[PDB]
Amino acid sequence: VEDEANQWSFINNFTLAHERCISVVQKLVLFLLSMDFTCHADLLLFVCKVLARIANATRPTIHLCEIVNEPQLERLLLLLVGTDFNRGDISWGGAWAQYSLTCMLQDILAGELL
Amino acid sequence: TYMACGTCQLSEPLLWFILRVLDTSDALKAFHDMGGVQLICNNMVTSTRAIVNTARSMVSTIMKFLDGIHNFAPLGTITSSSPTAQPAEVLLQATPPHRRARSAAWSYIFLPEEAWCDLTIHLPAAVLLKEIHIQPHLASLATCPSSVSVEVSADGVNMLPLSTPVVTSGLTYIKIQLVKAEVASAVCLRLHRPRDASTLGLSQIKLLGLTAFG
Amino acid sequence: LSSVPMLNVCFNKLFSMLQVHHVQLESLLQLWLTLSLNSLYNANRIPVISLNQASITSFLTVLAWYPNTLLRTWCLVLHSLTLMTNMQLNQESTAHLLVSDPNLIHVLVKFLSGTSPHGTNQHSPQVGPTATQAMQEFLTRLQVHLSSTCPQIFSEFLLKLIHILSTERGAFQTGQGPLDAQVKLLEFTLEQNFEVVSVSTISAVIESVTFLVHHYITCSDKVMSRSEMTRDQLMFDLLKLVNILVQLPLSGNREYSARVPAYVADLVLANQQIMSQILSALGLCNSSISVGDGLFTILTTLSKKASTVHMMLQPILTYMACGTCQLSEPLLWFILRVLDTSDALKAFHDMGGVQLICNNMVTSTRAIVNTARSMVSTIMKFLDGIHNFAPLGTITSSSPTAQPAEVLLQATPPHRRARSAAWSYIFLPEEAWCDLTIHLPAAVLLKEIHIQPHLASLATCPSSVSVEVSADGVNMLPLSTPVVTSGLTYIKIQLVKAEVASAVCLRLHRPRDASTLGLSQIKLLGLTAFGEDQVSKTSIGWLRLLHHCLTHISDLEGMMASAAAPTANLLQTCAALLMSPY
Amino acid sequence: LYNANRIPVISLNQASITSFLTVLAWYPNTLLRTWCLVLHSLTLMTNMQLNQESTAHLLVSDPNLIHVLVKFLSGTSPHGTNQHSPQVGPTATQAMQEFLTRLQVHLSSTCPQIF
């Protein structure tokens, strides 16, 4: 609706309060950090998509300083590039999940620098 | 010492060898004597906490239909960096008629200074590309490219090569398989000038792979 | 409320902890390039994540430690290093830091060496136009960032990289590595300025490159396959680079000294190895964009930028004396050009040049017999223009084929429709080579082989063909490496040296994706016993030398001719060569 | 006609063989024409007798044979403007195999240790 009046198009083939959006975003990040063998990759792609969409939708855009502290960001970075989760052909979540993580982080950074 | 120092890498021949070297009773006794099973248990705990499941769950099944390797060339578009005499979209057909091969489906003319020509294929979305198929002209494959380099780009803007240009002179069918399937949205085929021909003739380009939910 | 400092801290922590093999290098570099590009690739884009000096050095040393670095990863490395040139440090420059350590030398050597142990198809080691453009952008950003501070270290770094690459067991010598990347870096080096660079590394690189090019020229191949850009352009560009280099004058203590009036042509003149190498390389090059033209230009500019004419006559006469001697068309023209002035002739006579010349004509006339056709060949040729000899001979193969190959031996078979093939061969799964042995009734001076594959469907053209010649017809013997002819409509194997051969074996390889061979016609071109450069290597060149000495300037022709007179048998030899048709 | 069992009629000398071998190891960019010629000549050098150590032991003992074989099997070819496939062809491989087989035969009775 906002388009007729692209990075998340790989699935389909308004003004919001600041505090509750920040709380649900940081809880979504804590959900991301608590992803084990019970959780799956499609849930990861969809939570990344909804995280990027809520981050870009809220006015003003939520930045990462109020999203993650140093240990959470360090865990995310070692999750993205370290070979404790990116070893072999079974790298974290598969290439689709890595691409989705990259797109969500890129969207949040682009929202920060507007 | 290899399993501990490796997290650890464990393959099918390694599993069979570990099962074969632990065949005797004394092997199991010696394995337990110097602390092997506890390290194994720690490895399962660390690996289970490490790797998330990659299997398709119910969400992909119940969203796949709300909206077996398939071709993706007809979905995308094609372009070239140099103005050719004819567009190369005829190469993008699912199956063009290959029965007579009169002249060529697509032809390219080389300037004396240039040796490489690039065909950039832009897909509407990034796909898990697995293998490229290039069919040169079958009636006269003198116009087949001497060598072809395949380059992939996931974002569609950061142009980026895949490997060394493979020599296809004398090849009727070009099959460039990938050991690692790559998420790519743009594919550049840089074709080299043939060994003794100034023209290129091609029939059909295929883009084989999967999608996120296919 | 910017999260930039904590992310910088986290990436520096990652860059320090990757040393224990806990982070994949390719994933780390790709992600850092993607997060730094959010402000389409461009060399002018400033990355948003500013890195650290220790992080950059650790990344560089772990890259230099890592062998079999793929070209995917190599282009990723080049883009990341371009971004490392784009950054600023928080007071020395980052480009000076990148250039100072030899780790950048090691990474560039691993990149340009083009080893690829992974390659089961080590066909052509070129890295492609995108990677060459990325490396060129990296070098251009290096010159821009080091032009204001210190171009000395950058020019010294480039000369050291080329010199170490060009030494024994180097990438230019062995021939491995990306040809496009090497020629793009060389043409990039052409535009650089070397006006403070040390004379020691300059001497090392010039000696290494002259040894390599002389070893390539003197020991060249016996065949050439005729079809672009090849390694011939690499030699042409290296000689152009050293033509630029020798024109640079040096000023000061001849050490760490160029300063845009002695020249380095004198420095390469003091080196006996280089003069012997370049004169020998001009000794075996043919006359009329080519290597001989390049060698003529580098020696011409060496003579032009040289101060004293004495240092011009000393290497020439030591090469002619130490060589019997090899005397070619460019060497004759250079000797005539360096003996243009009156002082040149006076200095040549003063240190005993003409008498040595006279001894050389006597020794060469006593040495070489005339190769010209005399009257005997004319008056016997008819008592019993390159012609074919395939119809005269017979053909055979080591394996029983379905049809004999004598149809290939016709002078001109009808090539208008090409229904199936003139001759076809079927391959067993175990075998890959099939040999066609052609026995001629007599040995002929073979010059060039012509192989025509099937023209309607050249999928059956052989992937590679090796030509082997035998003069006696029994001692089977190869000519050179099997040449790849896949994708070639016409196969022309010329010989630089015409060979007396009576049996010719064409060993054809299995095609790349076809189990059948289809051929049309085999030609055997050459001459029989009785069917410019050929006179220059004889004593005629030295006779031209005497004529130019005694006739260029008439004022010095007398006393020097009086020195040329009392040599033994001069007049008899002159009369005997005047009585000759030559 | 060439054969690995043919005895050459000109018997050579030890100093001559060592000088030839060292000038071959000194000479770089040795062509494959010249290399197959070298292999046939070395096969003949295995075929000869000396006038009381064996000639095969003499050929094997010095590292010059290592240097010549390394230059042959390294397949450098700086001369090649068409460094396509460094294989030397079936005739040269058969000649080298015949040379190695003659080396084992001549050193089997005396000392296969050194071979």
UniProtKB/Swiss-Prot annotation, chain B:
Tissue expr: Expressed in brain cancer cells.
Localization per Swiss-Prot or TrEMBL: Golgi apparatus, trans-Golgi network membrane; Endosome; Cytoplasm, Cytoskeleton, Spindle pole; Cytoplasm, Cytoskeleton, Microtubule organizing center, Centrosome
Highest rank taxon of the organism: Eukaryota
Post-translational modification: Ubiquitinated; mediated by RNF41 E3 ligase and leads to proteasomal degradation, impairing inhibition of apoptosis. Deubiquitinated by USP8/UBPY. Autoubiquitinated; mediated by E1 ubiquitin activating enzyme UBA6.
Region of interest (HRRAR loop), ranges: 98-102
Described purpose of this protein according to its UniProt entry: Anti-apoptotic protein known as inhibitor of apoptosis (IAP) which can regulate cell death by controlling caspases and by acting as an E3 ubiquitin-protein ligase. Unlike most IAPs, does not contain a RING domain and it is not a RING-type E3 ligase. Instead acts as a dual E2/E3 enzyme that combines ubiquitin conjugating (E2) and ubiquitin ligase (E3) activities in a single polypeptide. Ubiquitination is mediated by a non-canonical E1 ubiquitin activating enzyme UBA6.
Domain topic, free-text comment: The BIR domain is essential for its anti-apoptotic function and is important for binding to DIABLO/SMAC and caspases.
Family: Belongs to the BIRC6 family.
Record note on quaternary structure: Homodimer; antiparallel. Interacts with RNF41. Interacts with DIABLO/SMAC, likely with higher affinity to SMAC dimer than SMAC monomer; this interaction blocks the substrate-binding site and inhibits the caspase inhibition activity of BIRC6. Interacts with KIF23/MKLP1, USP8/UBPY, BIRC5/survivin, MAP2K1/MEK1, RAB8A/RAB8, RAB11A/RAB11, PLK1, EXOC3/SEC6 and EXOC4/SEC8.
Protein name, per record: Dual E2 ubiquitin-conjugating enzyme/E3 ubiquitin-protein ligase BIRC6
Originating organism: Homo sapiens (Human)
